[PDB]
Design a protein around this nucleic acid. Structure first.
Lengths: 181, 106, 130, 170, 124, 61
RNA sequence: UUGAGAAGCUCAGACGAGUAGGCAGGCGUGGAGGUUUGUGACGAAGCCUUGGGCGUGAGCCUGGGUCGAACAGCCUCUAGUGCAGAUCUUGGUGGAAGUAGCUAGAUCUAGCGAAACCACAGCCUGGGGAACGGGCCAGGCAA
RNA sequence: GUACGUGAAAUUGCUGAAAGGGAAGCAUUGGAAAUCAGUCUUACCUGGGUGAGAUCAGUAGUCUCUCGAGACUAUGCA
């Protein structure tokens, strides 16, 4: 299934694997928005990736994730230039996308790709000492949004419980249960 | 506006090509819900179409359609090879192609 | 003589021509370029400003500003010839605009330059009758 | 002027003879089907009887308003809906001639073509409706007995999101 | 036997686009190190006998007729028995006077005229 | 306006238009996809005029 | 069955790189004898044109616009016969350039005004084996 | 229109068009805009009537050929 707008949560996702699936999707004429890019993960411990950046200048993981894709797409080709603008990488979950579903990519999930006991690095933690100086405010927004979202979930859960009780109380439900519904 | 859509959405990926040589006679189409070569057998023979609009009002309408036909599968991920009456423009990469259900074999 | 503009018949227009004028071609082209489309009386005032150094002709293609007076002097007679030819037709003077101007290269004998000018009118009639 | 003027090489005896067509098993008469192409695409129609290529089919006029029409088997989805008895209706009268398009006929005198004062209308003859009303009178009684069948033909076929025609058999 | 061509586009001379002293008429490039003569990728094609069209279709107009150049009205008469394969091309210098004599004669003969509406004008 | 169809000639259109209720008849002869001659007759037996149009520019041009 | 331009028509199979070089068939120009009882002031030749065609191609036929006095197809004869180069000859024309500047006025403003040079260009980063950077691929840049 | 036959290319100016991130350039495949290609049921066969004509007269003459082969002139239309 593909949509005109797709929101992908970057928490617990490998950078390269996430970059690959979005690179193909972007060439497919699809708009993809990436949120919480600061919580991306890269195989290899913290010092190695720190040395990698020291050899390498954009401090935003949203820019870094965009930069990784930029060299992973035909940038010279005008088609690649057009597809670049269809990708929107932002840190955290902004209000224009907080009230929308956030899907995940199985091919990039750390739990499905990383062996237990393997060291890994977090981009937001990595970027904190390279020029980024907004971790507190970015974090502060995260708990504020999730607290509001959790309250929304509780209201939705209560509504789901009420309708579920109403659904079971409905005699119509088991009239034609032979269809598996 | 629930209803209509007697076809299946599909995306026009690219042409049949080597690493550097492209043959634009046939184009790769990725149909939704098709994810294996054995599955693409069902869509072999269907009539695919490209639908686009233009400023000129021809016959009182504003729609131009380039018909086509699915021919063979392409790889293990459900892609297909479709030949059109007019070869698709190279700009329509990553667009929508409407795979209607005829000629039906079911 | 057949000119280079679809207008300039007796409709609302008068012509004027210059042949083998002893002025530098590049200067005439820049002078012609800036005065195109202006009002005839406005163009006359602007040409006076160039003589008085109040305004300077920009130099776009052949390059910023300059104050040529010889080329402007050549244009003054042609514009004066233009309105003198307008009067013979009996047009409406206060609405004259410089619809067309063109400077062409001449035989290489000093680089002379043919000059032509076309004056016209601007009109609009309301349809109404709704 | 009959003796062949030119060389005019004649077509060699082609070894092709017409044989009866073979239709799909589910295309047996009395089968609900999903019309695919034409001005009446998307409706559901039962199969009155088969033809040379097409299937003479009609939906209930008093339900869907689909007239008896030749519809090619390729532009028809064979639905596995419970079969409806269609033996009652007289299907023999349905032929190619009955469904033939009116011959390009009716010449006009060469004065009425000018001024456009000869235009007739081919408006559907009553017996064509009376044929169908008889068909309705022989299929409408049949269909109401099957529960929800009458509404099922009334409803219009369509696809929602995430619809895979191969996976969900029609 | 329908009128099918192995190629539409003409063969232009190599580098004929860059220069104007160089004519577009096809000239075989004899340059010793000429890579375009050497049939590299991204270059132009080159006339070969492999490009010939069907011998039962050579010289045939897209509608199947072969053009036949008729100077005067005598020439249009001999196409009496090949009207299904030949089309009476009217020469370019034939005056408008004899041009009507050629078209009216050819219309009754049954043959097809290719440039029947040149320099003339109908009147009703 | 009635686009000419069939093998009907001008001398037959004028007779037909006489009983239909017209007064004059205009024909815009076009050949080589360019209109060049206008002939007009006066119904029922009025004089006929034949002009050759030139410089016919549409309102767009 | 008409399919004898016997230099014709027809049938079958394999094959197709190319320098030096060898062989063959053709296209085109000027003029020459024959010919088309050829074309032409109702428009020859020429010319331009994103008109239409023909030929693998050299080339050809035609429509439109200009044009105004000649011209062509075919069989042979014949030769001062086919151009992208020769730091080629002659004529024309650009960029360079309103520049180098030179005649005034108050460095500027007017006025008068070259020659040299010129395949075409002009971000680099590296590797690209033979320079390769000035063009190739990876790159960034690129407004 | 005496800068005078035709007035090509280079080259330059004006206008309209589209295009215009350190080239351009051409080739394939299309698309789009702009524009041309070419449109044709109409004739054939059959039926009758109506008037005809002739290469036809259970017909009459001339001319050139070689009896009959043409071109005609009457006359009737079976």
């Amino acid at each position: 299934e593909f949509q005109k707008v797709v929101v992908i949560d970057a928490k617990g996702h490998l950078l390269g694997r996430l970059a690959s699936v979005v690179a193909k999707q972007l060439l497919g004429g699809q708009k993809v928005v990436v949120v919480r890019c600061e919580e991306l993960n890269i195989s290899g411990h913290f010092f190695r990736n720190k040395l990698k950046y020291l050899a390498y200048h954009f401090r935003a993981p949203s820019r870094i994730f965009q930069k990784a894709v930029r060299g992973m797409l035909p940038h010279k080709t005008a088609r690649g230039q057009a597809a670049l603008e269809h990708l929107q990488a932002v840190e955290g979950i902004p209000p224009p996308f907080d009230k929308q579903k956030r899907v995940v990519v199985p091919a990039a999930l750390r739990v499905l790709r990383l062996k237990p006991g393997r060291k890994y690095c977090t981009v937001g933690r990595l970027s904190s000492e390279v020029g980024w100086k907004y971790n507190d405010i970015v974090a502060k927004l995260e708990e504020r949004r999730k607290v509001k979202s959790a309250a929304f979930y509780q209201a939705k859960l209560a509504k789901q419980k009420k309708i579920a009780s109403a659904k079971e109380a409905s005699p119509v439900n088991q009239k034609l249960s032979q269809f598996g519904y | 506006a629930q209803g209509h859509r007697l076809y299946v959405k599909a995306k026009h990926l690219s042409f049949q090509r080597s690493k550097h040589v492209i043959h634009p006679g046939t184009s790769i189409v990725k149909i939704e819900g098709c994810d294996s070569k054995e599955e693409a057998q069902f869509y072999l023979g269907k009539r695919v179409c490209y639908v686009y609009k233009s400023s000129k009002a021809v016959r009182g309408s504003k729609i131009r359609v380039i018909w086509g036909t699915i021919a063979r599968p392409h790889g293990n991920s459900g892609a297909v090879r479709a030949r059109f009456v007019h070869n698709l423009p190279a700009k329509t990469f990553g667009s929508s192609l409407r795979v209607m259900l005829y000629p039906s074999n079911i | 003589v057949r000119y280079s503009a679809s207008p300039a018949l007796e409709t609302k227009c008068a012509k004027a021509r210059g042949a083998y004028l002893r002025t530098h071609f590049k200067n005439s082209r820049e002078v012609a370029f800036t005065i195109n489309g202006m009002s005839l009386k406005k163009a006359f005032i602007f040409l006076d400003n160039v003589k008085e150094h109040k305004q300077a002709v920009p130099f776009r293609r052949f390059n910023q500003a300059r104050w040529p007076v010889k080329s402007v002097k050549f244009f003054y007679d042609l514009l004066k010839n233009a309105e003198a030819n307008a009067e013979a037709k009996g047009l409406d003077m206060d609405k004259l605009i410089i619809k067309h101007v063109q400077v062409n290269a001449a035989p290489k004998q000093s680089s002379p330059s043919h000059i032509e000018i076309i004056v016209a009118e601007e009109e609009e009639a309301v349809p109404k009758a709704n | 002027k009959y003796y062949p003027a030119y060389r005019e090489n004649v077509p060699k005896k082609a070894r092709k003879a017409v044989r009866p067509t073979k239709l799909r098993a589910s295309l047996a008469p009395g089968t609900v089907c999903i019309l695919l192409a034409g001005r009446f695409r998307g409706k559901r129609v039962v199969v009155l009887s088969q033809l040379e290529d097409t299937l003479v089919v009609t939906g209930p006029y008093k339900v869907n308003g689909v007239p008896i029409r030749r519809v090619n088997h390729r532009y028809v989805i064979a639905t596995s809906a419970p079969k409806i008895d269609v033996s009652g209706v007289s299907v023999e009268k349905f032929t190619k001639a009955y469904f033939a398009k009116q011959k390009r006929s009716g010449p006009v005198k060469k004065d009425e073509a000018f001024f456009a004062e000869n235009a007739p209308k081919n408006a559907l003859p009553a017996e064509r409706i009376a044929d169908q009303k008889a068909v309705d009178a022989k299929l409408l009684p049949a269909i109401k007995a099957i529960p929800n069948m009458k509404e099922y033909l009334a409803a219009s076929f369509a696809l929602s999101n995430g619809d895979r025609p191969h996976l969900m058999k029609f | 036997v329908n009128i099918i061509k192995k190629r539409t586009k003409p063969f232009k001379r190599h580098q004929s686009d860059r220069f104007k002293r160089v004519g577009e008429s096809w000239r075989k490039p004899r340059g010793i190190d000429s890579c375009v003569r050497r049939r590299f990728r991204g270059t132009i094609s080159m006339p070969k006998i492999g490009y010939g069209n069907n011998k039962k279709t050579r010289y045939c107009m897209p509608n199947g007729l072969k053009a036949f150049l008729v100077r005067n009205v005598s020439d249009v008469e001999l196409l009496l028995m090949h009207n299904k394969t030949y089309a009476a091309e009217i020469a370019g210098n034939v005056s408008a006077r004899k041009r009507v004599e050629i078209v009216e004669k050819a219309r009754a003969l049954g043959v097809k005229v290719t440039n029947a509406g040149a320099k003339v004008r109908s009147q009703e | 306006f009635r686009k000419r169809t069939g093998d009907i000639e001008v001398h037959e259109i004028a007779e037909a238009a006489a009983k239909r209720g017209y007064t004059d008849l205009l024909v815009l002869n076009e050949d080589r996809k360019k209109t060049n001659a206008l002939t007009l007759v006066h119904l029922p037996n009025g004089p006929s005029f034949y002009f050759t149009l030139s410089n016919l520019q549409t309102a767009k041009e």
